[PDB]
Each structure stands twice: as C-alpha cells, then as structure tokens.
Paper text:
Among the bacterial P450s, one of the best characterized enzymes is the Bacillus megaterium CYP102A1 (P450 BM3), which Armand Fulco’s group identified as a fatty acid hydroxylase that could catalyze the hydroxylation of saturated fatty acid substrates, primarily at the ω-1, ω-2, and ω-3 positions. P450 BM3 (BM3) is a natural fusion of a cytochrome P450 (N-terminal) to a FAD-, FMN- and NADP(H)-binding cytochrome P450 reductase (CPR). More recent work in our group has used the double mutant (DM) form of the flavocytochrome P450 BM3 enzyme (F87V/A82F), in which the first mutation expands available substrate binding space in the active site, while the second mutation is more distant from the heme but causes a structural readjustment in the P450 that alters its conformational state. We also report the first structures of the BM3 DM heme domain in complex with four different azole drugs, confirming the greater plasticity of this variant and its ability to structurally adapt to bind to several azole drug compounds.
However, the structure of a P450 bound to tioconazole has not been reported previously. The crystal structure of tioconazole-bound DM heme domain is the first shown to bind this azole drug. The binding affinities for the WT and DM heme domains are 18.4 ± 0.9 μM and 0.39 ± 0.03 μM, respectively. In the case of voriconazole, it was clear the 2 R,3R-stereoisomer was bound, while for tioconazole the R-tioconazole was identified as the bound stereoisomer. Similarly, small mother liquor-derived compounds are present in the case of tioconazole (a molecule of 1,2-ethanediol) and voriconazole (a molecule of glycerol). The voriconazole, clotrimazole and tioconazole structures contain multiple monomers in the asymmetric unit, and in each case the general protein conformation corresponds to the “open”, substrate-free conformation of the enzyme, with little significant difference in protein or ligand conformation between monomers. For all the azole-bound structures reported in this study, the hetero-aromatic nitrogen ligand is oriented so as to fit within the groove of the I-helix formed between Ala264 and Glu267/Thr268. The binding mode of tioconazole to the DM heme domain is similar to those of clotrimazole and voriconazole, though the latter interacts with the heme prosthetic group through a novel ligation via a pyrimidine nitrogen from its 5-fluoropyrimidine ring.
Author numbering: 3 to 189, 194 to 457
Write the structure that this text describes.
C-alpha cells in the first residue's frame, strides 16, 4: 500500500539523483532497489515509475490512462510544436494529423519505400566494402548516416548525402547544439552574446532545411507520393481539411528526428549484441546468406528474415531506444489493487526494466537470446512495449523495423565482423540511447552488389 520513494534532499526532493548524464540508467538502478513502483518527486512535481508487467498492463488501459506530456515532452514542444509526438490526445491537431499521416506508414506505403531504403542501404555496404585493411567502422555514426538519409529520401525525397560527409549533416549538429543551448539557457550576460547566436544560426539552419524541403516539392514536376505528399495535400477524413502551414512545419521537423535517431540506436545495439554473442551472429548470418539470394534485397525477401527480426526485438528488449513514455490518470483509480491514484497523476513506464521482469522472461533476462521471440503468442500482453501503447503508439514502427531488418540482413550477408577492441558497453543518453564509441572491423565476404 505504502509507496516506496528514494532519497530526499530537502527542497530539491529527488532530483540530484538525476544529476547525471545517464538518468535512465540511474532510474533503472533505483528500480532494482525499490521494485516495481516508486514515487519520484521534484519541486512541484510527482512521478510514479512503473517497472513490472503486472502494473504496466493496467497503465496501458486507455479507458483509465491517457498519454501524458511529461516535462521532457513539454520542454521539446518549443521545437516540435503540436506535431504528432508532442500533442495531447484530445488536441485537435493530434487526431487530424494522425488521420492524415496514417496511410503513409501502412504495409503498402512500405512497399513503395523499399527501393529508396535499398538505395541508402547499398551506400552503407559500399562504404564498408571500400575501407582499407585495418581501418575500422564507427558503428552508431554510420548507422545515423543511414537512418537520417533514409527518412530524408523516403519521407521527403531530400538527399542528406550523409555518406558524402566526414562529419554529421549540419542539420543534425545545429539541432543537437540548439537543444542543449535551450537546456543551459534555463540557468543575460556579456559572454552569452556568442551563445544566443549559435542559437539563432542553428534555428536558421533548420528553418532553411524545412523551407527547402517544401520548396523543392512545390517546384518539382513530381512523380511523388510519400510522407511529404500527404502532409501538404492529405485531407482529414473527419473535417475534410488539410493540415495548416504551421503544423506541417512541426510535422516535418518531428519526422526528420523521430524517423532516424531511435532506429540508429537499434541497429547499433543489435550489432553490439551480435558481436558479443558469436553463436547468434553465425545463426543470423546463415539466414541472411540463405534468404538474400539477389544482388539487392526485395521487399518479400526482407519479410522472410525471421531470425534477423528476432535479433532486432531482443535488442529492443534489452535496450529500447525510446526507453520511457508517460501516462496520466483520467480519473481517480487504484493501481494494482494497492496504490490509489488521483485524477491527473503521472505514471512513467520504464521500458528497460519492464523488459527485465523475471516473472515474464525468466531468470536469464540479461542474456541475449533472440529465440525468446520464436512464438509471439507466448509473449504476454503488454510485456514488450518498445513502441509505446494504444492509439499513441509509434506510427513509424513498421518503417523502423523494415529498414533495420533490410540493413542488418545486408550487413550480415556481406561482412564478417570483429570486435577488435573488445568494446566495453557505454550507453550515451540523448533523446535516444546508443552504444557510444562502439567500433568494429568488417572483413568483406566479396559478394557483389546490384544496380
Ligand atoms: C526502433 C525505433 C523506434 C522506437 C523504439 C520508437 C518508439 C516510440 C515510442 C515508445 C513512442 C511513444 C512515445 C510516447 O508515448 O510518448 C513513439 C511514438 C512515435 N514515433 Fe516512434 N519509435 C521508433 C521509430 C520511429 C520512426 C522510424 C518514426 C517515423 C518515421 C517514428 C515516429 C513516431 C511518432 C510520430 C510518434 C508519435 C505517434 C503519435 O502519438 O501519434 N518512430 N515511438
Ligand atoms: Cl522524453 C522523450 C525523448 C525522446 C522521445 C522521442 C522518441 N521517439 C523517437 C521516435 N519515436 C519515438 O524522440 C524525440 C522526438 C523526435 C521527434 S519529436 C520528439 Cl519528442 C520522446 Cl517521445 C520522449
């Protein structure tokens, strides 16, 4: 009945516990100590972190709890506006944008996206084919090159050309530097006149890209029917109106970021686990060689990479790259027959801890075993939630998994991988998670590509 709560620092409640670069991992340690639920207090705010499937399945009941804009989400709303990720479920532009953009992520749009995904995937493979002996691969860096280019090309017919650059595309660098400048600005001096600029030019770099993506499309003798097409011309089935110009800008920035960061972390973590578990890599590589018999993979061939998809879900089990989502109680209710909640109370689903629930997965929760996912009907409801919940679940789930399956399959078909530094897992936390510094050597199997 009584709610566990970690340690207090007087007025600053529990916050100094998150005075760290890895707050999610710190919150996971707190969950290990206190268990399935614990209150976390901050000046003027209370959050309850859930970690067990028993409680989280109640939280995922949309008749009792709806998606909450956490403080983090309310903060980044300055950048993402009332786009799909940062709007309330009862905000009119959420339902309207959901209705308009849902057809862009169907298992029919994916068929039309496939060739452009292959385009960027081939560029990745060719980069690694062209490395000299004893040169190595910066894995999350190259996965980000891939996922950024893929969402840019598939969604907006815009080429970031990340494999033509030595460092991240200026749009990425400007946003990363703009987000932290907004973080530090919360804490009017002469020496900040340089900061308020790096800011202004960063805002301009991103407004210029959004302007160009829209202008390129309007000037195009267009054979285009992609995500941007529906943003600009899709009519709402309810109201019959398209999205307004301001919301469209927010959706473009929303999908550019959401469309690549979490998928890059997934591919990075999957390759990390494969090189740390050579028996699983050998098994996945055998499926890639068996299934991908053509110079470029086809849509149907990717859908037959069954074990690769299991490798991906097991990487999402251990390190779901969007590791938490927030809910609020629609009315007074009792959670799990033990914990009374008031209307408006916030719940935070700690996905990595949920995915380590021994009562669901057994004692070996830390082992990388993709065979856990051989029979999806053996996985209880709400035990596996890497893509959120309900009507506010990830609209891009199928996009991410198709891209990641295609790419990982092509990686396994064309290269043997060596953990040449004996890499020690270091998880950097930004908007997503990724294994920082993860490097490998890839020896080419010398299998031709197509074109
Ligand atoms: C492995 C990769 C990904 C993971 C783990 C992931 C995870 C999630 C999660 C947990 C949520 C719910 C957030 C919340 O409740 O506050 C969400 C929502 C969302 N995601 Fe993803 N995502 C991934 C890839 C993508 C991709 C590729 C796209 C776009 C192409 C995308 C776009 C979105 C959008 C627009 C929403 C908001 C949906 C709505 O509320 O209407 N995500 N995602
Ligand atoms: Cl605290 C927090 C941090 C990051 C995210 C999302 C996760 N994610 C990515 C793709 N699907 C879900 O990434 C940041 C982001 C990207 C566009 S808008 C927006 Cl916020 C959320 Cl939801 C909440």
């Amino acid at each position: 009945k009584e709610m566990p709560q970690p340690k207090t620092f007087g007025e600053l409640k529990n916050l100094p516990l998150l005075n760290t670069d890895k707050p999610v991992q710190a919150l996971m340690k707190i969950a290990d100590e206190l268990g399935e639920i614990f209150k976390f207090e901050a000046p003027g705010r209370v959050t309850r972190y859930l970690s067990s499937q028993r409680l989280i399945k109640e939280a995922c009941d949309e008749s009792r709890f709806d998606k909450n804009l956490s403080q983090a989400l309310k903060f980044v709303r300055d950048f993402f506006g009332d786009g799909l990720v940062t709007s309330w479920t009862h905000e009119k532009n959420w339902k309207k944008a959901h209705n308009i953009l849902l057809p862009s992520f169907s298992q029919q749009a994916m068929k039309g996206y496939h060739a452009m995904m292959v385009d960027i995937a081939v560029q990745l493979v060719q980069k690694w084919e062209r490395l000299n002996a004893d040169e190595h691969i910066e894995v999350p860096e190259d996965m980000t090159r891939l996922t950024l280019d893929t969402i840019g090309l598939c969604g907006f017919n815009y080429r970031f050309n990340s494999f033509y650059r030595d460092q991240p595309h200026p749009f990425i660098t400007s946003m990363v530097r703009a987000l932290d400048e907004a973080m530090n600005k919360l804490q009017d001096d002469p020496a900040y006149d340089e900061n308020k600029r790096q800011f202004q030019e960063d805002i301009k770099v991103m407004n210029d890209l959004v302007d160009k993506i829209i202008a390129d499309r309007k000037a195009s003798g267009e054979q285009s029917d992609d995500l941007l097409t529906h943003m600009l011309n899709g009519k709402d089935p309810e109201t019959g109106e398209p999205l307004d110009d301001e919301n469209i800008r927010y959706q473009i920035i929303t999908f550019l970021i959401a469309g690549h960061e979490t998928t890059s972390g997934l591919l990075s973590f999957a390759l990390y686990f494969l090189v740390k578990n050579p028996h699983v890599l050998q098994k996945a590589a055998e499926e890639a060689a068996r299934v991908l018999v053509d110079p470029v993979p086809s849509y149907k061939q990717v859908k037959q990479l069954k074990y690769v998809g299991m490798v991906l879900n097991e990487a999402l089990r251990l390190w779901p790259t969007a590791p938490a989502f927030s809910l609020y109680a629609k009315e007074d209710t009792v959670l799990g027959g033990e914990y009374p909640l008031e209307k408006g109370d916030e719940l935070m689903v700690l996905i990595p801890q949920l995915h380590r629930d021994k009562t669901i997965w057994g004692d070996d929760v830390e082992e990388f075993r993709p065979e856990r996912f051989e029979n999806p009907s053996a996985i209880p409801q709400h035990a596996f939630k890497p893509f959120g919940n309900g009507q506010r679940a990830c609209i891009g789930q199928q996009f991410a998994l198709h891209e990641a399956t295609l790419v990982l399959g092509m990686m396994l078909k064309h290269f043997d991988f060596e953990d040449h530094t004996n890499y020690e897992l270091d998880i950097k936390e930004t908007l997503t998670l990724k294994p920082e510094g993860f490097v490998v050597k890839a020896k080419s199997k010398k299998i031709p590509l197509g074109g």
